[PDB]
Design a protein around this nucleic acid. Sequence first.
DNA 1: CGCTTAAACGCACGTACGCGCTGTCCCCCGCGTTTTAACCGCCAAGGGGATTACTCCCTAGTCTCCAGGCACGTGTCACATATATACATCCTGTGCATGTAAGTGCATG
DNA 2: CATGCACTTACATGCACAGGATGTATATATGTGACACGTGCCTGGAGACTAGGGAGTAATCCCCTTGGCGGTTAAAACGCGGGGGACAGCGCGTACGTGCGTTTAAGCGG
Lengths: 83, 83, 97, 97, 75
Amino acid sequence: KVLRDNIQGITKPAIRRLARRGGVKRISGLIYEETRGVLKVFLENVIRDAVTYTEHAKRKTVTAMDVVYALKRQGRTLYGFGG
Amino acid sequence: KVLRDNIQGITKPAIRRLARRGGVKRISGLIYEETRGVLKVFLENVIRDAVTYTEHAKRKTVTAMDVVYALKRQGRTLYGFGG
Amino acid sequence: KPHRYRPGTVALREIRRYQKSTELLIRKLPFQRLVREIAQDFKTDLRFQSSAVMALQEASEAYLVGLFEDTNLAAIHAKRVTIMPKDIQLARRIRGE
Amino acid sequence: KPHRYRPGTVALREIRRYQKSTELLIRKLPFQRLVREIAQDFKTDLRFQSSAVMALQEASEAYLVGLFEDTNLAAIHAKRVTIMPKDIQLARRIRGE
Amino acid sequence: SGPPVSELITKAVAASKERSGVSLAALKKALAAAGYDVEKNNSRIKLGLKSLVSKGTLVQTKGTGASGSFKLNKK
DNA sequence: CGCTTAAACGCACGTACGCGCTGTCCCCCGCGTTTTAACCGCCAAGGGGATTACTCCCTAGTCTCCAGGCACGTGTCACATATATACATCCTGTGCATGTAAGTGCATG
DNA sequence: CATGCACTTACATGCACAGGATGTATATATGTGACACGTGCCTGGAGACTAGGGAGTAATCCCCTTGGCGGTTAAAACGCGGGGGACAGCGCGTACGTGCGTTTAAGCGG
């Protein structure tokens, strides 16, 4: 029921694709797991606030405008889902 | 009353002092005029904001209250001036 | 003879492709698994609107991509073409993360 | 022979001093004169509280110093000890300006 | 045409005779002063210097290969 | 829960990339010397920020009403995908110029 | 007769250019569903009136800001050797791009 490993669900080729979108052509092997940790850090940084909004709404299911709020708190305002 | 070249009034040893407070061990010779331009651009941004606040206050006297409004508006909030 | 491109040529070609493309580079379902895993660590039995998971996605690689142009500029700043994790540490520290 | 310190020794000493010190590092009167000079460019006959000028001096010095530590991070990241114009340009662009 | 680069290299190493050997950059500057288009002949000068190292005419002082300092034999 | 298929994965293998060594010029730095203007200290001017007073312009609020935009529904062509074709490009085979090495004939000791 | 030297000739190496491959670019086909538009509606915007209160404005004054001289150096500047540092070059050994078959798990769809 519980989950233990999904950080490896972000595969090395997916990271390679993102770096090609980032304009990176050559990637060290040390990159991938450290970037997994960094993005994971960003993930609880956003999802803690998202959960806080969700419980403060007296909802158990996470809704998208809560995510919109939590992303504009980090100076990372997202367009196309507000409202 | 009318002054022209006070960007050079921020003298080179003053820039060296700022760098040594910034932990800079060696400074290139090309650094100083660039930093003059950088501090320039930063300062007309913040004082353009300050001027806009002051004219909105129907004043010609610049207050530090307007200054701290301007600095927190650019996300560079300063403490210690009555805010 | 089986053709083989020299290194960087292909990588530049999908650089151009993914700069052209707008599609999402993450396997969606493992990402959703990771979201539910991490969110369960703070509150149990969390249920997700799929649009929220999607928005969390494009926010995530928005941050990741912008990090990669930052680190790529850092690497070419250091006169190198192969990226190092210390470049990522530098970018995070300069951004104030 | 007359005494002479080797380079960097006095530099490290004043680094320790100015990290220890808290005062403003630029002269008050030319800074106020420059502030009046550039504020005159937007609107004419502006009067200044000295507290406002000191706040500008303080915020400017802190902003410049933080940019300088970013420059230091770039320089040690570039395997150098001498700061360079491209370091400040990079740091400004990474910060987003 | 003229003579090959080997006479140029041995003239460059015999021109100075420092306690340390002459370096690659110093010998390239010496041949630029003497007159040679060294900008396209970097591979040519590298192969020539490595070949004359293998002859035993020159011994490399501190560097390895075409890097470092270069000094002539005992005799 | 079942089908499907491309993505991941992992292995092979070359190559280009960090990157350390060496060196080399030259760039700020420490150490003075000059010089200059920052600052303090003081003093005079006045002006506009702020404060009080008076006023009235405006706007939030209330009642009435109606139409503007939104939900819903429904045709419909823009374009995603598919298919066939052209060209850019990129590696790669090959041909050329140039440098170099070696043999050797010839003048000479 | 032997020998240095020059001359000539053969071979290795770096550079140029043609040539195919191929992945991308270029041309319709289509069928579809997203998109754009007709329609009920009601609620939210608007019209008339009111009351009252926030803001605009006069005065003033005084406090705070501006303007000015003169020591007073600290600081700014200037110069100069000279070490330390950016940086070019090279070798080199590697780790990662590239290619290809596999499994799986991502994805559809119900």
